[PDB]
Amino acid sequence: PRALSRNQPQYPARAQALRIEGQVKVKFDVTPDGRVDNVQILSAKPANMFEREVKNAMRRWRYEPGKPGSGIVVNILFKIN
């Protein structure tokens, strides 16, 4: 599987206001038409902070048609400069 567009998650307002960094690791599948599928959250730091923004964004992610895969894993890091 190769990525074609992976729209960036928004930085949660509470996290930016409290100067909080972290990360979320995601696992999902890649359909024949380049749709992202069966999204799970494998780990998240800190808990109850970044998940919803990741899941939202991932709805829009598009990959290459057509080479599917099963547990494709992406780690997403949230940083404040």
């Binding site: 990525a3 992976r6 960036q8 998650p9 928004q10 930085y11 307002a13 509470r14 996290a15 930016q16 206001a17 409290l18 100067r19 909080i20 690791k25 069966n38 999204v39 959250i41 800190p46 808990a47 109850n48 998940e51 919803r52 899941k55 709805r59 894993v73 992406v74 780690n75 997403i76 890091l77 949230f78 940083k79 404040i80 400069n81």
Partner: protein, 590 residues
């Protein structure tokens, strides 16, 4: 695994309300929902109960967490929308949806950081976006609805951006009936709405840190409604509202300090008249206001949070007869505020205090605090308390309907909330109480405003969002018990219960949305015979269905069915609602 990296955008200033219940609506939400009015947006949101004296363009009222229609503070880019009327209630039917790029919405005790008179909540309509490109859009629906819109945002030089927008929206509408309010004879005319908007903005970065903007916009709305008919007298049946706003500002945006100095002017003219006698005839009314605001706000990052502080100045002047005050009025206000936010271990604290000096009412302070604890990873308890303060409008003191000894409404308010993330479900549940003293009402008998004692509001707010495979679920539940504490009688037009459920999914590149709403039991006054009795309206369920398809990379077509089962219902007794309505639209982007 690949790593994506998300870096906080420094040009975003998040508010110190991280502990408050808040909702943001983006332009992606609005586009998808195919909303043709601002009310169609706010009605989706927790704590919000909207009523309406008909349909598009007719008066709508917003009850946040059981409070009155004037208890919601409505801001446009952080500044009060022009509100000249004696009722003191915002009518967001008149604000054009084409200007709305984001809505920021808060409710409960913390709301009054934005202004001490946000007893129920704050609705902040943001008209600016960062979205390069051009969009041309067009749409048609039931009751001869038509909309044409063009907007563009373009680089005018390397550090200078220009945004332009024009919008035209028209509907013939339907007969609102206005049962019991039309005097001797009903007016079976269709009651439509025409709204034309124009907007321009210019933003310029002097350096990476220092920026400047200037913006201007206006709209011209004509609405038809139904009114008291007496044969041989003027029938004030139509409204012409003109509005224009002009803003200019300087921002410093550093790593740790952010400062803005903004200057705003808004001029509104609201006419009600009989087309047959004319809009300048002695029979027409005009509410006209010029409002000038200067704000200076500052925020400093401090550890795990920040401290903010600022000063504001507002002047309102109204012309003779505005608010039925024979000669109009002049009102001035000077405010200072302080805010603080800090996470310490598993505890978060937030606090704000403001003081306002009013040319009429003198000096008043309000304040709020929240303390949160994450007691198990992912799970929080948050407690919060605040006060609020709302002076009568000068109309309610000095005009035809006025009572010069009216006292201000004061509110004490608390809330306790749990939030969690449990098996993919982001949930929150809170209970709240609002005690509002010296509650202001209008007396039908004597045609004057009075203080009517105290209101006591108790409520529960519950929210959940979660995804089940291809489906996204957004759910809220509200219960509100809003009573006049002296008579224990329920406050009118507030639903005891609401359920809101959004369900989104895509299949085969079609993006679908189902919206369900349950509106619970509501009391209202029957005006068809005196003394005016209270009626109870039963609960109703309403369904909307919306679909979007990207025909090409630049063209999307959308279709909507609002009230899919053509359910009859009313949010104000006597005022008919639309019934089942169809919309088709298109957006071409480049």
């Amino acid at each position: 695994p690949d790593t994506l990296v998300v870096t906080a955008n420094r040009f975003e200033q998040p508010r110190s309300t991280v502990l408050a219940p808040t909702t943001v609506v983006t332009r992606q939400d609005i586009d998808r929902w195919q909303s043709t009015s601002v009310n169609d947006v706010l009605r989706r949101l927790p704590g919000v109960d909207i009523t309406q004296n008909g349909g598009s363009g007719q008066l709508s009222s917003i009850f946040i967490r059981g409070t009155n229609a004037s208890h919601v503070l409505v801001l446009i880019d952080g500044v009060r929308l022009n509100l000249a009327g004696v009722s003191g209630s915002a009518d967001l039917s008149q604000f054009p949806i084409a200007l709305v790029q984001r809505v920021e919405y808060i409710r409960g005790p913390r709301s009054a950081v934005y202004g001490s008179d946000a007893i129920g909540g704050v609705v902040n309509i943001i008209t600016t976006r960062d979205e390069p490109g051009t969009e041309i859009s067009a749409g048609w629906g039931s009751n001869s609805y038509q909309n044409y819109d063009v907007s563009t945002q373009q680089q005018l030089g390397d550090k200078t951006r220009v945004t332009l927008l024009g919008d035209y929206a028209h509907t013939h509408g339907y007969d609102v009936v206005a049962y019991g309010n039309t005097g001797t004879q009903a007016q079976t005319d269709n009651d439509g709405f025409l709204s034309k908007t124009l907007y321009g903005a210019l933003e310029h970065n002097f350096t990476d840190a220092w920026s400047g903007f200037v913006r201007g916009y206006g709209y011209d709305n004509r609405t038809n409604y139904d009114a008291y008919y007496s044969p041989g007298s003027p029938l004030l049946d139509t409204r012409k509202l003109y509005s224009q706003s002009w803003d200019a500002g300087l921002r410093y945006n550093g790593e740790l300090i952010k400062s803005q100095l903004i200057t705003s002017y808004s001029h509104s003219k609201d006419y009600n008249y009989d087309p047959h006698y004319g809009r300048y005839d002695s029979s027409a009314t005009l509410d006209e206001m010029k409002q000038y605001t200067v704000q200076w706000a500052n925020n400093v990052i401090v550890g795990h949070g920040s401290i903010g502080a600022g000063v504001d100045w507002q002047k309102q002047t109204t012309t003779p007869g505005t608010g039925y005050v024979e000669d109009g009025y002049d009102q001035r206000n000077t405010g200072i505020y302080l805010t603080g936010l800090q996470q310490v271990g598993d505890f978060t604290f937030e606090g704000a205090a403001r003081s306002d000096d009013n040319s009429q009412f003198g000096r008043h302070g309000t304040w709020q605090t929240s303390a949160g604890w994450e007691f198990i990873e992912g799970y929080r308890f948050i407690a919060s308390y605040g006060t609020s303060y709302k002076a009568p409008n000068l109309g309610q003191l000095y005009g035809f309907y006025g009572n010069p000894n009216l006292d201000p409404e004061k509110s004490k308010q608390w809330e306790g909330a749990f939030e969690g993330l449990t098996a993919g479900v982001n949930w929150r549940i809170s209970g709240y109480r609002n005690d509002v003293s010296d509650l202001i009402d209008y007396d039908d008998h004597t045609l004057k405003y009075y203080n009517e004692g105290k209101a006591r509001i108790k409520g529960v707010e519950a929210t959940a969002n979660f995804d089940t495979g291809p489906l996204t679920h957004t759910v809220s539940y509200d219960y509100v018990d809003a009573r006049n504490a002296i008579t224990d009688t329920p406050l009118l037009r507030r639903a005891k219960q609401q359920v809101k459920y959004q369900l989104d999914w895509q299949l085969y590149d079609f993006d679908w949305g189902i919206t369900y709403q349950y509106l619970g039991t509501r009391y209202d006054k029957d005006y068809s015979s005196y003394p005016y009795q209270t009626v109870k309206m039963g609960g109703v369920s309403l369904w909307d269905l919306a679909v979007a398809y990207p025909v090409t990379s630049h063209l999307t077509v959308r279709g909507k069915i609002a009230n899919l089962f053509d359910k009859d219902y009313e949010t104000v007794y006597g005022y008919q609602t639309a019934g089942r309505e169809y919309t088709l639209s298109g957006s071409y982007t480049f």
